[PDB]
């Protein structure tokens with residue numbers, strides 16, 4: 001069903017998260033973590049304190065798809081177990097901010113062709129697939145985008161709801 005999913009997304013904030021490669025999304029899916037540049041780290045930390053759920057919607061550049069979505073479970077922190085991200089050419093690990101813990105809500109993909117009817121008011125009402133890394137997606141567009149993903153029957157949102 002979709003009811004617990006709608007409950008998790010109620011009054012959420014949503015952010016488009018870009019990855020240069022599939023490897024980093026695979027790491028994020030396996031380890032429940034993400035790390036971004038300080039400019040976006042600061043925005044996500046502010047958002048985490050502001051809303052009952054903050055949703056990251058992931059897209060690998062040039063893939064033509066979203067690879068899933070997850071909810072922040074923490075503000076960023078430093079000093080944890082290192083993560084061997086594959087970073088863009090010319091980027092060292094020290095250029096990243098801290099590490100956010102995330103709980104995956106859907107690990108299934110969604111092709112951009114399926115979201116062509118959704119526009120993001122916070123990016124000039126351009127199609128929601130369009131945006132820089134860290135672009136916020138307004139509530140209604142973000143909710144509808146998440147509801148387009150195929151249901152992920154491997155995930156139980158009971159555990160997510162309790163963290164809220």
Ligand SMILES: CNC(=O)c1cccnc1
Nearest residue numbers: 020024035036037085087
């Ligand atoms: C795992 N994180 C990354 O790959 C990245 C790279 C540049 C900017 N933001 C995030």
